[PDB]
Amino acid sequence: VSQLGPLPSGWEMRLTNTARVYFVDHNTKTTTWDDPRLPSSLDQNVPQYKRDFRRKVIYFRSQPALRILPGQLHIKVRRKNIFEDAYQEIMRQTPEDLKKRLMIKFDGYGGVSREFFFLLSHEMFNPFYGLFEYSAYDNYTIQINPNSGINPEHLNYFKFIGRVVGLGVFHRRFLDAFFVGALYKMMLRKKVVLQDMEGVDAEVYNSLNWMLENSIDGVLDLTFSADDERFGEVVTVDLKPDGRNIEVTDGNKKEYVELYTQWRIVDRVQEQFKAFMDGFNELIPEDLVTVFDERELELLIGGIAEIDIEDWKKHTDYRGYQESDEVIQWFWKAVSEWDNEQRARLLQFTTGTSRIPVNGFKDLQGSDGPRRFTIEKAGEVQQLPKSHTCFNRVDLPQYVDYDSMKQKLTLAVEETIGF
Amino acid sequence: QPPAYDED
Amino acid sequence: MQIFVKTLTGKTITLEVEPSDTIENVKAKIQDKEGIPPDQQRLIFAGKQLEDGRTLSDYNIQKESTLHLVLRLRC
């Protein structure tokens, strides 16, 4: 059934005595009902949103439009130049070319894809480049910066980003997408409602949500026009034909509030977002991604950012160790103590990324296919912990004591991937 | 459980 | 003279070496104080990648130079 893609390396699919498909993991020396090319099964007592999610993922992963093309595509980038390099290496390929397998090589394969997407998304989605901006100084979720156009070629960078966000969706790669909730709606062509103004502009939100319930006349006077702050100057725009003249009162409020919202959030970044989806669409057909609601899309693009320690521990394979050895117990102790960031950096070190599937660590992806997080007995005491980002394994030496283990484990993650 | 990994 | 090893985090580690000292002998000066084994160590001086069989004078590494520490811990 290779309309869903061919199996991962070391996988066989046989039939039960009654022709009920099951699979063989030549790697794990095990077998399962779950297709490794599809999200893992859901255990009973699991929220509908999650079961329904695994369901829509298969739907979305079966359509001809989401099918890898024969051959491969090469992306040569340098790590300190990942952004400008990726831009060139990618905006020069057509959409069809961009659908082949990804062979990414940092100057000087499969598991490099995770590390590639995780890292590039850090760059694009950084408010540094003026492409995006933190909505507030509080929430570190981002949204399109309307001032992006100070750079004449800025609509290109968006098309590139859209290609990339779509490419990560297309090739099953997670992104550090911390978007505002309203952006995912726009990616699904769902209308944006006044609720969205909360995550965008928490200030104007509470204001707009006051003129709908409370009094208006003799309290505030305005028209169907707004003020656009761009670069120290301001420009009044009509929210509708002849807006700067049509006043607003307790009898208008439904309109203005419903025109301002659509302006500040959507229209104001019409060009930027128009281009973005133009690129996201070269890969992910609009009429396909719309199988998801705003939440599911956000999860599809970006996976689960918050690592669950107890699920991680429950789904770690051991090699040369028992689940009750001093080093292992100690290892999980370090994790417990560590904040999320300290954990994410460790995962970023071992797997290549800090994102995790909605199915949790049960279905943690490697380069080839399914690969559970693995801790193996290897290396000497004075040796730093090592990793193979394609295998999800960490050769953890059997350190003699705690304080010495937690030391070498730190400089390994602090120096290799010093986030 | 399905056929436990056996022969190779 | 003195050389400064700047790890990928900015941890400048002042050392005490001579131009004659082998690259192999440098990492061993770093191990003894920071723990990291010379095997895993990878040192870079101006784009180059200092090699063992050489000396600390081969790559024209004058005083108060600056090598960057790289740790091969990943595949």
Residue numbers in the entry:
A (entry chain A): 383 to 490, 496 to 806
B (entry chain C): 105 to 112
C (entry chain E): 1 to 75
How is this structure described in the published paper?
To address the mechanisms of HECT E3-mediated Ub ligation, we studied Rsp5, the single essential NEDD4-family member from Saccharomyces cerevisiae. Rsp5 has a typical NEDD4-family domain structure consisting of a C2 domain, three WW domains, and a HECT domain. The catalytic HECT domain consists of an N-lobe that binds E2, a flexible linker, and a C-lobe containing the active site cysteine. Rsp5 binds via its third WW domain to a PPXY motif (residues 106–109) in Sna3, and ubiquitinates Sna3 at Lys125.
